[PDB]
């Protein structure tokens, strides 16, 4: 698809047999989601947006479907107001910013 | 242009007559630029993201050249870690996400 930006670029994501919603975010390096009791070991990490820093849990090798497209990568889990698909997964689905 | 997301989508912008560098951010409703002086009256505003809220001065109807494309719209001046072009101006230059 070609998604204009008049509203938030929200898509359906599936991760661990749970359908959720996420923002296609060109300004996020990493993918940040709410808790979904992800399987596997994790590492603690700090991330920051405008407003300061949050404590997150880093899970690698996570399988996720983004608007139908299958992707695999690092998903950080922490207190994020909205679920965020960062460039790290956006590149996997071939997402580009065009104008 | 078509911009892949293997690195931060940074572009040259011109604002207040100054050339600056800024991030094309589809996850941002608003445009947030580091401390600079701009013409017209501003109003005090608080914007939120990950980590919490910051205080910005809101200027309306600011002319801005994003990667050679003129746009007019609201610009928030504040203590941002990086200059951010939000959807409010991305829509002004016809930017779309594509995959
Ligand atoms: O003092 C300033 O220079 C601006 C203060 C300011 C900007 N946005 C704000 C929001 C709430 C309270 C104060 C502010």
Swiss-Prot record, chains A, B:
Residues 1-5, 49-55, 88-99 are annotated as: Dimerization of protease. The active site is at 25 (for protease activity). It comes from the Viruses. Residues 20-89 form the Peptidase A2 domain. Aspartyl protease that mediates proteolytic cleavages of Gag and Gag-Pol polyproteins during or shortly after the release of the virion from the plasma membrane. Cleavages take place as an ordered, step-wise cascade to yield mature proteins. This process is called maturation. Displays maximal activity during the budding process just prior to particle release from the cell. Also cleaves Nef and Vif, probably concomitantly with viral structural proteins on maturation of virus particles. Hydrolyzes host EIF4GI and PABP1 in order to shut off the capped cellular mRNA translation. Homodimer, whose active site consists of two apposed aspartic acid residues. This is Protease. The chain holds residues 490 to 588 of 1436 of the full protein.
């Amino acid at each position: 698809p070609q998604i204009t930006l008049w509203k938030r670029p929200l898509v359906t994501i599936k991760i661990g047999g749970q359908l959720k919603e996420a923002l296609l975010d060109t300004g996020a390096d990493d993918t940040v989601i709410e808790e979904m009791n992800l399987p596997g070991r994790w590492k603690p990490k700090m991330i920051g947006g405008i407003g300061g820093f949050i404590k997150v849990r880093q899970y690698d090798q996570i399988i996720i479907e983004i608007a139908g497209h299958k992707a695999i990568g690092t998903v950080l889990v922490g207190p994020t107001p909205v679920n965020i698909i960062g460039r790290n997964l956006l590149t996997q689905i071939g997402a580009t910013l065009n104008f």
